[PDB]
Design a binder for this molecule. Structure first.
Ligand SMILES: Nc1ncnc2c1ncn2[C@@H]1O[C@H](COP(=O)(O)OP(=O)(O)OC[C@H]2O[C@@H](O)[C@H](O)[C@@H]2O)[C@@H](O)[C@H]1O
Lengths: 239, 48
C-alpha cells in the first residue's frame, strides 16, 4: 500500500520517465552538524499523518545549498502521482509571511484580513506558501484553508509550509526510520528538549530546510524565495 | 480604536447595549457589534 515509482517532469517538454522511490531523491541533502558543508544524503521524506485529519501530508528535508527546482519537481511529481498528469496548473503563487509568536491583533481586523484572504483564496485558486509552524498567522492561514478545503472540488490546492529543520519538535522521530516513512505519525504534544515549535496540521506539504543548526532561525528564507521565483518562471504566473 | 484604547470601550458598551435595547435604537446595536460586544455579559438596572 505504498507508491514505489514517481512520474517526474522533464525540463523542456511534457513529462519525464518514472523513476523509483530509491531513485531521484539523492539530490536532496542534509547536514548532521553545522560544521559540515557538503553534508550527507538526507533519507528523511515521505508522508506524515496528523490527528483529526482525513488526509495525509508529504514532507521532505532539503539542504540550504540544494536546488529549489528539484523541490519544485518534487511538488510536481507528487501532484502527478496523486491527481494524475492532467492536474490543474496554478495561475497565482500566493506567499504569506508574518510574525509567528508575536501575532496579536484585534478580532475585527483579523476577521477583515481573514475575509479578504478567504475571498482571495476562493476566487484565485492559488498555491499558498506560508511558514510551516502552528503559531500565529500561519495557523490563521491554515484555518482559512481548512475552512475553504472542506468543499475543495476535485483539485485541492497545495499549502506548502517551508520551515527550518532543527526547530520542529517532531523532526527527530521523522528522520529516524525507513526512507519512505509513509506512515509516520506526528505528535504535536511531544516535548522535545532543544526545540519548541510544532508544525501546523492544515498544511498540505512540508519542506524542511537544513543548515546544521539547532534552534537558530532564518535559514528558510532564500530557498523559499528562489522556490517561489522558480515556480513563477515554471508555471508562468505572478507571485 | 485607532489610538489603541479598548478597556474603557469594553467597560462602556455593555451598558450601552443595555440602554440601546431599552431605548429602541437598532443602528446603535448594529454598530456596537463587531467591536467585541459580548451580548451574554449584560447586567440589568435593578436587582431581582
Ligand atoms: N517560523 C517561526 N516559528 C516559530 N517561531 C519563530 C519563527 N521565526 C522566528 N521565531 C521565533 O519566535 C519569536 C517571535 O518572532 P516573530 O516576530 O513573531 O516572528 P518573526 O521573527 O517575524 O519570524 C518570521 C518568519 O515567519 C515566516 O512568516 C517567515 O518565513 C519568517 O521566516 C522570534 O524571536 C523568533 O526567535
Amino acid at each position: 500500500v505504498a507508491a514505489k515509482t514517481l512520474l517526474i517532469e522533464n525540463e523542456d517538454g511534457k513529462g519525464s520517465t518514472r523513476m523509483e522511490v530509491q531513485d531521484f531523491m539523492k539530490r536532496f541533502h542534509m547536514h548532521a552538524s553545522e560544521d559540515d558543508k557538503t553534508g550527507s544524503p538526507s533519507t528523511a521524506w515521505g508522508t506524515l499523518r496528523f490527528p483529526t485529519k482525513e488526509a495525509t501530508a508529504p514532507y521532505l528535508r532539503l539542504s540550504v545549498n540544494d536546488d529549489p527546482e528539484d523541490a519544485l519537481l518534487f511538488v510536481k511529481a507528487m501532484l502527478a502521482q496523486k491527481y494524475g498528469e492532467t492536474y490543474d496548473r496554478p495561475s497565482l503563487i500566493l506567499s504569506v509571511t508574518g510574525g509567528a509568536r508575536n501575532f496579536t491583533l484585534p478580532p475585527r481586523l483579523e476577521t477583515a484580513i481573514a475575509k479578504g484572504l478567504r475571498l482571495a483564496a476562493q476566487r484565485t485558486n492559488a498555491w499558498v506558501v506560508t511558514g510551516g509552524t502552528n503559531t500565529g498567522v500561519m495557523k490563521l492561514t491554515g484555518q482559512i484553508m481548512e475552512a475553504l478545503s472542506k468543499t475543495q472540488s476535485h483539485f485541492i490546492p497545495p499549502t506548502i509550509g517551508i520551515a527550518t529543520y532543527g526547530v520542529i519538535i517532531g523532526g527527530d522521530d521523522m528522520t529516524r526510520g525507513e526512507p519512505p516513512k509513509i506512515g509516520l505519525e506526528y505528535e504535536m504534544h511531544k516535548k522535545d528538549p532543544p526545540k519548541t515549535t510544532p508544525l501546523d496540521d492544515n498544511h498540505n506539504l512540508f519542506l524542511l530546510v537544513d543548515d546544521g543548526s539547532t534552534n537558530k532561525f532564518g535559514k528558510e528564507i532564500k530557498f523559499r524565495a528562489a522556490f517561489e521565483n522558480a515556480a513563477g518562471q515554471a508555471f508562468a504566473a505572478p507571485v | 480604536s485607532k489610538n489603541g484604547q479598548h478597556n474603557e470601550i469594553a467597560a462602556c458598551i455593555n451598558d450601552n447595549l443595555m440602554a440601546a435595547m431599552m431605548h429602541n435604537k437598532p443602528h446603535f446595536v448594529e454598530l456596537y457589534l463587531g467591536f467585541d460586544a459580548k451580548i451574554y455579559e449584560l447586567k440589568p438596572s435593578e436587582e431581582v
